[PDB]
Short mmCIF file of C-alpha atoms and ligand atoms in Angstrom, two decimals:
data_model
loop_
_atom_site.label_atom_id
_atom_site.label_comp_id
_atom_site.label_asym_id
_atom_site.label_seq_id
_atom_site.Cartn_x
_atom_site.Cartn_y
_atom_site.Cartn_z
CA UNK A 1 77.38 55.60 74.90
CA UNK A 2 80.32 55.61 77.82
CA UNK A 3 80.86 58.81 80.81
CA UNK A 4 83.99 59.65 79.82
CA UNK A 5 87.52 59.10 81.68
CA UNK A 6 88.15 61.76 84.20
CA UNK A 7 91.33 62.71 85.50
CA UNK A 8 90.53 65.24 87.67
CA UNK A 9 87.46 66.86 89.92
CA UNK A 10 87.30 69.63 93.03
CA UNK A 11 83.78 70.75 94.87
CA UNK A 12 84.05 73.62 93.38
CA UNK A 13 84.99 76.21 91.13
CA UNK A 14 89.13 78.05 91.92
CA UNK A 15 88.68 81.75 93.14
CA UNK A 16 85.68 82.17 92.87
CA UNK A 17 84.04 83.04 96.29
CA UNK A 18 85.87 83.10 99.07
CA UNK A 19 87.41 79.86 99.92
CA UNK A 20 86.63 79.76 104.00
CA UNK A 21 82.55 79.97 102.60
CA UNK A 22 82.90 78.00 99.90
CA UNK A 23 84.01 75.77 102.22
CA UNK A 24 81.69 76.20 104.86
CA UNK A 25 78.45 75.54 102.05
CA UNK A 26 79.79 72.09 101.26
CA UNK A 27 79.13 70.92 104.89
CA UNK A 28 76.01 70.90 103.08
CA UNK A 29 76.51 68.52 101.17
CA UNK A 30 79.41 66.33 102.93
CA UNK A 31 78.92 67.17 106.12
CA UNK A 32 81.62 68.92 108.60
CA UNK A 33 84.30 67.05 108.16
CA UNK A 34 85.90 65.99 104.74
CA UNK A 35 88.87 65.75 102.43
CA UNK A 36 90.69 66.79 99.02
CA UNK A 37 93.51 65.35 97.23
CA UNK A 38 96.20 67.29 95.48
CA UNK A 39 98.74 64.76 93.70
CA UNK A 40 100.27 63.17 96.70
CA UNK A 41 99.13 65.61 99.21
CA UNK A 42 95.76 65.38 101.31
CA UNK A 43 93.78 67.62 103.18
CA UNK A 44 90.85 67.59 105.77
CA UNK A 45 88.83 70.24 106.31
CA UNK A 46 86.64 71.10 109.89
CA UNK A 47 83.23 72.58 110.35
CA UNK A 48 82.42 71.64 113.54
CA UNK A 49 83.29 72.74 116.74
CA UNK A 50 83.21 69.82 118.50
CA UNK A 51 85.57 68.18 115.69
CA UNK A 52 87.17 71.87 116.12
CA UNK A 53 88.21 71.23 119.54
CA UNK A 54 89.20 67.85 119.27
CA UNK A 55 92.09 68.81 117.05
CA UNK A 56 93.27 72.22 118.61
CA UNK A 57 92.75 70.65 122.57
CA UNK A 58 92.01 66.77 122.94
CA UNK A 59 94.42 65.71 120.03
CA UNK A 60 96.40 69.19 120.19
CA UNK A 61 100.05 67.51 119.73
CA UNK A 62 99.19 65.02 117.50
CA UNK A 63 98.23 68.20 114.87
CA UNK A 64 100.53 70.77 115.74
CA UNK A 65 102.05 70.70 112.83
CA UNK A 66 102.98 73.02 110.07
CA UNK A 67 102.73 71.64 106.62
CA UNK A 68 105.64 73.27 104.61
CA UNK A 69 104.72 76.10 101.40
CA UNK A 70 107.36 77.62 99.33
CA UNK A 71 106.40 81.15 100.11
CA UNK A 72 106.13 80.21 104.28
CA UNK A 73 109.32 79.44 103.39
CA UNK A 74 111.26 82.34 102.09
CA UNK A 75 108.85 84.46 104.30
CA UNK A 76 109.66 82.26 107.66
CA UNK A 77 113.30 82.26 106.33
CA UNK A 78 112.52 77.76 106.06
CA UNK A 79 110.25 77.15 109.06
CA UNK A 80 112.27 79.05 111.89
CA UNK A 81 110.52 81.48 113.63
CA UNK A 82 106.65 80.17 115.21
CA UNK A 83 104.09 80.67 113.18
CA UNK A 84 104.77 78.74 110.66
CA UNK A 85 107.98 76.40 111.72
CA UNK A 86 106.24 72.72 111.97
CA UNK A 87 106.22 72.13 115.68
CA UNK A 88 110.19 70.37 116.84
CA UNK A 89 112.21 71.92 119.32
CA UNK A 90 113.22 75.00 117.87
CA UNK A 91 108.80 76.20 117.85
CA UNK A 92 108.85 74.77 121.29
CA UNK A 93 110.87 77.45 122.94
CA UNK A 94 110.67 80.22 120.23
CA UNK A 95 107.58 79.79 121.21
CA UNK A 96 108.24 79.84 125.68
CA UNK A 97 110.26 82.46 125.20
CA UNK A 98 107.64 84.84 123.32
CA UNK A 99 104.94 83.90 126.28
CA UNK A 100 107.64 84.62 128.97
CA UNK A 101 108.67 87.28 127.47
CA UNK A 102 104.86 88.64 128.16
CA UNK A 103 104.85 87.69 131.79
CA UNK A 104 107.31 90.52 131.94
CA UNK A 105 104.95 93.43 131.00
CA UNK A 106 102.41 92.72 134.04
CA UNK A 107 103.46 94.99 135.97
CA UNK A 108 105.76 97.98 137.23
CA UNK A 109 105.51 101.33 135.32
CA UNK A 110 106.87 99.05 131.49
CA UNK A 111 102.96 98.41 131.83
CA UNK A 112 101.83 96.83 128.72
CA UNK A 113 98.62 99.17 129.86
CA UNK A 114 100.82 102.00 130.03
CA UNK A 115 103.39 101.22 126.57
CA UNK A 116 100.12 101.05 124.60
CA UNK A 117 98.72 103.96 126.26
CA UNK A 118 101.17 106.53 125.63
CA UNK A 119 100.87 105.55 122.05
CA UNK A 120 97.08 105.82 121.78
CA UNK A 121 97.66 109.58 123.24
CA UNK A 122 100.16 110.34 120.45
CA UNK A 123 98.08 108.41 118.11
CA UNK A 124 94.83 110.88 118.83
CA UNK A 125 96.60 114.39 119.34
CA UNK A 126 97.46 113.08 115.69
CA UNK A 127 94.28 112.29 114.63
CA UNK A 128 93.16 115.55 116.32
CA UNK A 129 94.66 117.27 113.25
CA UNK A 130 92.15 116.29 111.08
CA UNK A 131 89.31 117.28 112.22
CA UNK A 132 86.98 117.85 109.97
CA UNK A 133 88.32 116.12 107.76
CA UNK A 134 87.60 111.93 105.62
CA UNK A 135 90.89 109.85 106.33
CA UNK A 136 92.10 106.62 105.88
CA UNK A 137 93.19 105.85 109.79
CA UNK A 138 95.36 102.67 108.22
CA UNK A 139 98.99 104.06 108.36
CA UNK A 140 98.19 106.28 112.14
CA UNK A 141 97.15 103.80 113.58
CA UNK A 142 99.86 101.60 111.75
CA UNK A 143 102.91 103.73 113.71
CA UNK A 144 100.84 102.79 117.03
CA UNK A 145 100.48 99.60 116.98
CA UNK A 146 104.23 99.29 115.61
CA UNK A 147 105.66 100.84 118.27
CA UNK A 148 103.71 99.31 121.04
CA UNK A 149 105.32 95.85 120.21
CA UNK A 150 108.68 98.21 118.87
CA UNK A 151 108.80 99.15 122.52
CA UNK A 152 107.46 95.20 123.49
CA UNK A 153 110.63 93.44 120.94
CA UNK A 154 113.37 96.32 121.90
CA UNK A 155 112.55 99.31 124.21
CA UNK A 156 112.91 101.57 121.39
CA UNK A 157 109.91 103.12 119.02
CA UNK A 158 109.72 105.54 115.83
CA UNK A 159 109.38 109.15 116.25
CA UNK A 160 106.96 110.62 113.98
CA UNK A 161 108.51 111.53 110.50
CA UNK A 162 110.68 109.00 110.78
CA UNK A 163 110.75 107.12 107.31
CA UNK A 164 111.35 103.88 108.79
CA UNK A 165 107.73 103.11 109.66
CA UNK A 166 107.04 104.13 105.60
CA UNK A 167 109.36 101.04 104.81
CA UNK A 168 108.40 98.70 107.06
CA UNK A 169 104.65 99.91 105.85
CA UNK A 170 105.61 98.26 101.68
CA UNK A 171 106.99 95.67 102.61
CA UNK A 172 104.33 94.35 105.13
CA UNK A 173 102.47 95.49 102.06
CA UNK A 174 104.64 93.33 99.43
CA UNK A 175 104.82 90.62 101.61
CA UNK A 176 101.58 89.71 102.34
CA UNK A 177 100.56 90.78 99.11
CA UNK A 178 102.38 88.13 97.56
CA UNK A 179 102.21 85.53 100.13
CA UNK A 180 99.16 84.08 98.54
CA UNK A 181 96.65 85.24 96.90
CA UNK A 182 93.85 84.92 98.66
CA UNK A 183 93.80 82.46 101.41
CA UNK A 184 96.73 80.97 102.89
CA UNK A 185 94.38 77.46 101.75
CA UNK A 186 94.94 77.21 97.58
CA UNK A 187 93.41 73.96 96.08
CA UNK A 188 95.10 74.23 92.98
CA UNK A 189 99.84 75.13 93.37
CA UNK A 190 99.38 77.38 90.81
CA UNK A 191 102.69 78.78 91.46
CA UNK A 192 104.23 75.63 89.98
CA UNK A 193 102.26 75.25 86.53
CA UNK A 194 102.49 78.58 85.22
CA UNK A 195 105.58 81.03 85.02
CA UNK A 196 105.01 83.62 86.95
CA UNK A 197 107.03 85.96 89.60
CA UNK A 198 105.99 85.20 93.14
CA UNK A 199 108.13 84.18 95.01
CA UNK A 200 110.75 86.10 92.87
CA UNK A 201 108.59 89.37 94.43
CA UNK A 202 108.64 87.66 97.82
CA UNK A 203 112.27 87.42 97.93
CA UNK A 204 112.84 90.17 97.42
CA UNK A 205 110.49 92.11 100.17
CA UNK A 206 111.61 89.69 102.96
CA UNK A 207 115.36 90.16 102.04
CA UNK A 208 114.30 94.54 103.12
CA UNK A 209 112.62 92.42 106.37
CA UNK A 210 115.58 90.86 106.98
CA UNK A 211 117.48 93.68 106.38
CA UNK A 212 116.50 95.69 108.64
CA UNK A 213 115.76 93.10 111.64
CA UNK A 214 119.41 92.48 110.68
CA UNK A 215 120.59 96.09 111.89
CA UNK A 216 118.90 96.07 114.65
CA UNK A 217 119.81 92.88 116.12
CA UNK A 218 123.24 93.40 115.37
CA UNK A 219 123.04 97.06 116.83
CA UNK A 220 121.76 95.48 119.65
CA UNK A 221 124.29 93.20 120.82
CA UNK A 222 125.95 95.52 121.66
CA UNK A 223 123.45 97.06 124.12
CA UNK A 224 122.50 93.71 125.51
CA UNK A 225 122.96 93.07 129.11
CA UNK A 226 122.36 89.78 131.55
CA UNK A 227 121.21 92.49 134.09
CA UNK A 228 118.46 93.72 131.97
CA UNK A 229 115.72 91.74 130.48
CA UNK A 230 112.99 93.83 129.78
CA UNK A 231 111.92 93.01 126.02
CA UNK A 232 111.22 90.02 124.32
CA UNK A 233 115.14 90.61 122.41
CA UNK A 234 117.09 90.11 125.67
CA UNK A 235 114.82 87.20 126.61
CA UNK A 236 116.25 85.60 123.36
CA UNK A 237 119.70 86.31 123.59
CA UNK A 238 119.75 85.58 127.48
CA UNK A 239 118.75 82.32 126.29
CA UNK A 240 121.30 82.01 123.88
CA UNK A 241 123.74 83.08 126.08
CA UNK A 242 122.68 80.17 128.41
CA UNK A 243 122.61 78.05 126.24
CA UNK A 244 120.16 74.89 123.47
CA UNK A 245 122.71 76.35 121.55
CA UNK A 246 122.32 75.21 117.82
CA UNK A 247 118.35 76.24 118.59
CA UNK A 248 119.25 79.94 119.34
CA UNK A 249 121.00 81.67 116.06
CA UNK A 250 120.75 84.89 115.21
CA UNK A 251 118.17 83.16 111.78
CA UNK A 252 116.15 82.02 114.42
CA UNK A 253 115.76 84.81 116.92
CA UNK A 254 116.01 87.17 113.94
CA UNK A 255 112.31 85.45 112.63
CA UNK A 256 111.04 85.09 115.35
CA UNK A 257 110.74 89.00 116.61
CA UNK A 258 109.71 89.52 113.39
CA UNK A 259 107.35 87.15 113.87
CA UNK A 260 106.53 88.45 116.82
CA UNK A 261 106.54 92.01 114.36
CA UNK A 262 104.83 91.23 111.47
CA UNK A 263 101.90 89.72 114.01
CA UNK A 264 101.90 93.17 115.92
CA UNK A 265 100.70 95.02 113.41
CA UNK A 266 99.26 93.36 110.93
CA UNK A 267 96.23 91.76 112.46
CA UNK A 268 95.38 94.84 115.34
CA UNK A 269 95.60 97.39 112.94
CA UNK A 270 93.06 95.50 110.57
CA UNK A 271 90.47 94.52 113.58
CA UNK A 272 89.80 98.28 114.21
CA UNK A 273 89.50 98.82 110.72
CA UNK A 274 86.86 96.68 110.72
CA UNK A 275 85.21 98.07 113.79
CA UNK A 276 85.12 100.86 112.60
CA UNK A 277 83.44 100.19 109.23
CA UNK A 278 80.79 98.51 111.48
CA UNK A 279 80.12 100.92 113.16
CA UNK A 280 79.75 103.52 110.48
CA UNK A 281 76.97 100.94 109.16
CA UNK A 282 75.46 100.27 112.45
CA UNK A 283 75.10 103.45 113.59
CA UNK A 284 72.65 102.21 116.15
CA UNK A 285 75.13 101.01 117.68
CA UNK A 286 77.75 103.58 117.46
CA UNK A 287 75.41 106.33 119.21
CA UNK A 288 74.96 103.50 123.24
CA UNK A 289 79.02 102.82 122.51
CA UNK A 290 79.31 107.10 123.04
CA UNK A 291 76.44 107.10 125.57
CA UNK A 292 78.11 103.80 128.03
CA UNK A 293 82.19 105.49 127.92
CA UNK A 294 80.00 109.03 128.30
CA UNK A 295 78.17 107.82 131.19
CA UNK A 296 80.98 105.30 132.44
CA UNK A 297 83.77 106.82 132.11
CA UNK A 298 83.37 110.49 131.69
CA UNK A 299 86.21 113.38 130.58
CA UNK A 300 87.89 113.51 133.74
CA UNK A 301 90.41 110.98 132.47
CA UNK A 302 91.48 108.85 129.97
CA UNK A 303 90.17 105.56 129.71
CA UNK A 304 91.68 102.28 131.51
CA UNK A 305 92.09 98.74 131.20
CA UNK A 306 89.94 98.39 134.17
CA UNK A 307 87.55 100.44 132.41
CA UNK A 308 86.53 96.37 130.72
CA UNK A 309 84.43 95.52 133.76
CA UNK A 310 81.99 99.01 132.44
CA UNK A 311 82.19 99.23 129.29
CA UNK A 312 79.76 96.27 128.28
CA UNK A 313 79.08 97.41 124.82
CA UNK A 314 82.89 97.67 124.23
CA UNK A 315 83.94 94.96 124.89
CA UNK A 316 80.57 92.82 122.71
CA UNK A 317 81.23 94.64 119.55
CA UNK A 318 85.19 93.89 119.68
CA UNK A 319 83.77 90.08 120.41
CA UNK A 320 81.49 90.69 117.84
CA UNK A 321 83.82 91.83 115.56
CA UNK A 322 85.87 88.20 115.55
CA UNK A 323 82.87 86.37 115.32
CA UNK A 324 81.79 88.19 111.56
CA UNK A 325 85.01 88.62 110.21
CA UNK A 326 87.90 86.40 112.23
CA UNK A 327 91.37 87.79 110.93
CA UNK A 328 92.42 84.24 110.21
CA UNK A 329 88.50 82.59 109.08
CA UNK A 330 90.76 79.47 108.89
CA UNK A 331 93.23 79.43 111.84
CA UNK A 332 96.79 78.53 109.55
CA UNK A 333 97.01 74.94 108.95
CA UNK A 334 97.64 72.88 110.97
CA UNK A 335 99.35 69.66 109.85
CA UNK A 336 99.11 65.85 112.15
CA UNK A 337 102.39 65.07 113.31
CA UNK A 338 101.45 61.57 113.61
CA UNK A 339 98.97 58.12 112.90
CA UNK A 340 95.67 60.09 114.77
CA UNK A 341 92.21 59.97 113.86
CA UNK A 342 88.88 63.05 114.25
CA UNK A 343 85.90 61.68 115.20
CA UNK A 344 86.42 58.48 114.42
CA UNK A 345 87.65 58.95 110.75
CA UNK A 346 91.20 57.48 110.43
CA UNK A 347 94.05 60.28 109.79
CA UNK A 348 98.13 60.13 108.19
CA UNK A 349 100.50 61.14 109.47
CA UNK A 350 101.74 64.42 107.08
CA UNK A 351 97.93 65.19 106.59
CA UNK A 352 96.94 69.10 106.91
CA UNK A 353 94.46 69.65 108.60
CA UNK A 354 92.19 73.23 108.22
CA UNK A 355 90.08 74.16 110.85
CA UNK A 356 87.41 76.26 109.27
CA UNK A 357 86.53 78.86 111.25
CA UNK A 358 84.07 80.69 109.65
CA UNK A 359 82.35 77.80 109.71
CA UNK A 360 82.17 77.86 113.16
CA UNK A 361 82.11 81.04 113.47
CA UNK A 362 78.27 81.25 111.74
CA UNK A 363 77.06 77.47 112.17
CA UNK A 364 73.65 78.69 112.30
CA UNK A 365 72.24 76.08 115.16
CA UNK A 366 74.89 77.83 117.76
CA UNK A 367 74.32 81.63 116.44
CA UNK A 368 71.45 83.42 116.13
CA UNK A 369 70.94 85.23 112.95
CA UNK A 370 75.00 84.20 112.28
CA UNK A 371 75.18 86.85 109.61
CA UNK A 372 73.87 89.76 111.45
CA UNK A 373 76.21 92.51 113.01
CA UNK A 374 74.71 91.79 116.43
CA UNK A 375 77.09 92.99 119.36
CA UNK A 376 73.91 91.67 122.12
CA UNK A 377 74.55 88.59 121.04
CA UNK A 378 77.43 88.71 124.04
CA UNK A 379 75.10 90.28 126.52
CA UNK A 380 72.85 89.01 129.05
CA UNK A 381 69.51 90.72 127.99
CA UNK A 382 69.31 93.80 130.60
CA UNK A 383 73.23 94.78 129.17
CA UNK A 384 74.36 94.36 132.57
CA UNK A 385 76.55 91.15 131.88
CA UNK A 386 79.01 89.74 129.00
CA UNK A 387 77.53 85.94 128.12
CA UNK A 388 79.66 83.38 126.38
CA UNK A 389 75.94 82.67 123.26
CA UNK A 390 77.60 79.74 122.20
CA UNK A 391 80.83 77.61 122.67
CA UNK A 392 81.38 77.48 118.16
CA UNK A 393 83.76 80.77 119.10
CA UNK A 394 87.73 80.04 118.64
CA UNK A 395 88.91 83.41 117.49
CA UNK A 396 92.09 82.40 118.95
CA UNK A 397 92.64 78.93 118.33
CA UNK A 398 93.12 76.96 121.45
CA UNK A 399 95.65 74.74 121.98
CA UNK A 400 99.22 74.24 120.90
CA UNK A 401 99.01 77.34 117.74
CA UNK A 402 96.63 78.66 119.55
CA UNK A 403 97.65 82.94 119.53
CA UNK A 404 100.36 83.72 122.04
CA UNK A 405 99.25 87.27 121.17
CA UNK A 406 95.73 86.82 122.72
CA UNK A 407 96.30 89.72 125.71
CA UNK A 408 97.97 92.29 123.81
CA UNK A 409 95.56 92.28 121.22
CA UNK A 410 92.84 92.26 123.34
CA UNK A 411 94.08 95.08 125.15
CA UNK A 412 95.32 97.31 122.72
CA UNK A 413 91.29 96.66 120.90
CA UNK A 414 89.42 97.74 124.28
CA UNK A 415 91.89 101.05 124.97
CA UNK A 416 91.79 101.87 120.83
CA UNK A 417 88.45 102.05 120.78
CA UNK A 418 87.58 103.21 124.12
CA UNK A 419 90.10 106.12 123.59
CA UNK A 420 89.34 107.20 120.18
CA UNK A 421 84.79 107.14 121.33
CA UNK A 422 85.54 109.03 123.33
CA UNK A 423 86.68 111.99 121.86
CA UNK A 424 86.38 111.65 118.48
CA UNK A 425 82.61 111.80 116.19
CA UNK A 426 83.47 109.10 113.47
CA UNK A 427 81.18 109.42 110.29
CA UNK A 428 80.49 108.63 107.00
CA UNK A 429 82.91 110.84 105.03
CA UNK A 430 81.48 113.38 102.71
CA UNK A 431 80.87 111.45 99.32
CA UNK A 432 78.45 108.83 101.28
CA UNK A 433 80.71 105.98 100.75
CA UNK A 434 80.32 103.10 103.88
CA UNK A 435 83.24 100.86 103.55
CA UNK A 436 83.12 96.89 101.95
CA UNK A 437 82.11 94.98 104.12
CA UNK A 438 82.66 91.97 102.06
CA UNK A 439 86.58 92.10 103.25
CA UNK A 440 89.21 90.70 101.14
CA UNK A 441 90.69 86.69 102.22
CA UNK A 442 94.89 86.99 103.07
CA UNK A 443 96.82 85.49 105.18
CA UNK A 444 94.69 87.51 107.41
CA UNK A 445 91.23 89.16 106.17
CA UNK A 446 91.69 92.86 105.31
CA UNK A 447 88.53 95.25 105.02
CA UNK A 448 89.31 96.96 101.80
CA UNK A 449 90.51 100.61 102.54
CA UNK A 450 87.61 103.27 103.02
CA UNK A 451 87.76 107.20 104.49
CA UNK A 452 86.56 108.09 107.74
CA UNK A 453 85.23 112.04 109.22
CA UNK A 454 86.73 112.36 111.98
CA UNK A 455 85.94 115.30 113.92
CA UNK A 456 86.72 116.50 117.48
CA UNK A 457 83.98 115.76 120.16
CA UNK A 458 81.62 118.69 121.06
CA UNK A 459 81.38 117.37 124.66
CA UNK A 460 85.28 116.30 124.52
CA UNK A 461 85.84 120.50 123.59
CA UNK A 462 84.07 121.00 126.58
CA UNK A 463 85.07 119.22 129.01
CA UNK A 464 88.91 120.43 128.66
C1 HEM B 1 92.70 90.07 116.81
C2 HEM B 1 94.05 89.90 117.51
C3 HEM B 1 94.16 88.78 116.81
C4 HEM B 1 93.62 87.29 116.58
C5 HEM B 1 92.20 87.15 116.27
C6 HEM B 1 94.41 86.20 116.31
C7 HEM B 1 94.27 84.33 116.08
C8 HEM B 1 95.34 83.78 115.85
C9 HEM B 1 95.25 82.55 115.45
C10 HEM B 1 93.52 82.00 115.03
C11 HEM B 1 96.61 81.97 115.18
C12 HEM B 1 96.34 80.47 115.10
C13 HEM B 1 96.32 78.82 115.33
C14 HEM B 1 96.16 77.67 114.75
O1 HEM B 1 96.99 77.79 113.78
O2 HEM B 1 95.73 77.04 115.06
C15 HEM B 1 97.30 82.88 115.62
C16 HEM B 1 99.28 82.80 115.76
C17 HEM B 1 99.11 83.00 116.24
N1 HEM B 1 99.21 84.36 116.51
FE1 HEM B 1 97.27 85.37 116.62
N2 HEM B 1 95.98 86.54 116.24
C18 HEM B 1 96.03 87.87 116.68
C19 HEM B 1 97.00 88.99 117.04
C20 HEM B 1 98.01 88.33 117.92
C21 HEM B 1 99.36 89.04 117.90
C22 HEM B 1 98.80 90.94 118.33
C23 HEM B 1 99.96 88.56 117.73
C24 HEM B 1 102.13 89.39 118.63
C25 HEM B 1 101.84 90.42 119.11
C26 HEM B 1 100.03 87.31 117.86
C27 HEM B 1 101.08 86.07 117.62
C28 HEM B 1 100.37 85.49 117.25
C29 HEM B 1 101.46 84.30 117.21
C30 HEM B 1 102.98 83.97 117.02
C31 HEM B 1 100.80 82.76 116.48
C32 HEM B 1 100.92 81.45 115.58
C33 HEM B 1 101.36 80.70 117.24
C34 HEM B 1 102.41 79.03 116.56
O3 HEM B 1 101.58 78.71 115.87
O4 HEM B 1 102.11 79.14 117.46
N3 HEM B 1 98.70 87.58 117.35
N4 HEM B 1 96.19 84.30 116.22
C1 UDJ B 2 103.52 87.56 106.78
C2 UDJ B 2 103.63 88.90 108.41
C3 UDJ B 2 103.24 90.03 108.20
C4 UDJ B 2 104.13 90.56 106.93
C5 UDJ B 2 105.16 90.94 106.79
O1 UDJ B 2 105.99 91.49 106.60
C6 UDJ B 2 105.99 89.63 107.41
C7 UDJ B 2 105.66 89.25 108.39
C8 UDJ B 2 105.38 87.33 109.15
C9 UDJ B 2 104.61 86.74 110.48
C10 UDJ B 2 103.54 86.99 110.26
C11 UDJ B 2 103.05 87.56 109.17
C12 UDJ B 2 101.33 88.32 109.39
C13 UDJ B 2 100.78 87.49 110.05
C14 UDJ B 2 101.10 85.69 110.82
C15 UDJ B 2 100.87 85.58 109.96
C16 UDJ B 2 100.56 85.99 112.03
C17 UDJ B 2 99.02 86.12 112.95
C18 UDJ B 2 98.15 85.36 111.47
C19 UDJ B 2 96.75 85.38 111.86
C20 UDJ B 2 97.00 86.09 113.43
N1 UDJ B 2 97.77 86.07 114.48
C21 UDJ B 2 98.71 86.12 113.59
C22 UDJ B 2 101.71 85.46 112.87
C23 UDJ B 2 102.85 85.87 111.90
C24 UDJ B 2 102.52 87.23 111.31
#
């Protein structure tokens, strides 16, 4: 007897468990870095913080490419924009101009905190009308963060009830659903093996997004003034005006805006939902957050960015959400721009390189009870200082492809949660259902929809 000819072998079953956890589980057997080959393409998975910092920082510019994928081509109008653009002149310029835009929001009256706090004030007024009811907070949050990013991109915001917000919500959901079935990392290219309409559906969602962004962009050509640079579109059109010209085509500007607009809405809304869900599961933590805000902010005023110096448990809670349920548990796929190496192992040019951030955030040697939600791990024993308990922590990535929206994200998350906790009791709905914390890996790590009972806090009422 003889062993069977083997035509293919994969180390775990496809579509069974979360990909980021399956890869992590493999490290027990093969170590923290290993490879898989599908047809002619090789993918390397990295699951230890030293190798990841080599890829992202030390040799960051060797591994700053993006792999090409059929779905990503459609969302990115063929690898324009930032997030899905390959390393190259177009990416570098648009990333730099996007980053420079955030500097226009450093100080003054258009300061970032002021834009955020005004949209949070409307959100809170809206939620307060639901006093005593159980609601899904997704859309009210989505609206506030959509208005924040719309103001950053264009200096415009949507009035309550504007049907465009429902149009955007609809295509956002459709693009996320069709961009990947689970994570962006897939061992088997199912799209190309069996007949399906995934690409056709994605194109129809992206066409609506593109048509909407095209209308704004064209209408803005009439408003743009060399003498007034106050938002992201101004910044891009100024660079075009002073132009390289080919790298700032209308389609290039549109896709970069769509990347910022899309990232500014989906990332922040998801993290807010996760934070509320963990707090419904951990009432002891929620109780201490009320005490911390009642003692440090009170009700004389609304929370401010400066309050990050005092609401330490709230900052730790957010840090712990981003550790336990990272927005991007495998970042976005990287690619070797040149022949290089990771941990002394050769990596050819063109190899896809995946950083398993989940593995970094759940490494047993780097963290105590990594499966557990414990905001106190980011505080000292007294609870008087924030600490960095581990170097194996990279929620925003690092190096050339690191998140450019980090400052916005941290301010939005902190302010939304501080305003909500000052004003609202947030409780399990009356049928006793808790949110599932298992999550749904998509291009972003989403949580299942859930309801929360909302009540205006008595302490707030008494104080008015
Ligand atoms: C909690 C919220 C967020 C987290 C945890 C987060 C994290 C990350 C991560 C892990 C990456 C990929 C790093 C890599 O591929 O190596 C990334 C990239 C990126 N993020 Fe975020 N992000 C957040 C919110 C935002 C926001 C609010 C925006 C825009 C306002 C934004 C814009 C981007 C862009 C454009 C990229 C692509 C960078 C590039 O490829 O050059 N992100 N982010
Ligand atoms: C797909 C989506 C949302 C849906 C939509 O309408 C189109 C839009 C296109 C841009 C996408 C965006 C989803 C988050 C992305 C992938 C992102 C990101 C990811 C994780 C952390 N930070 C940022 C940067 C690019 C963003």
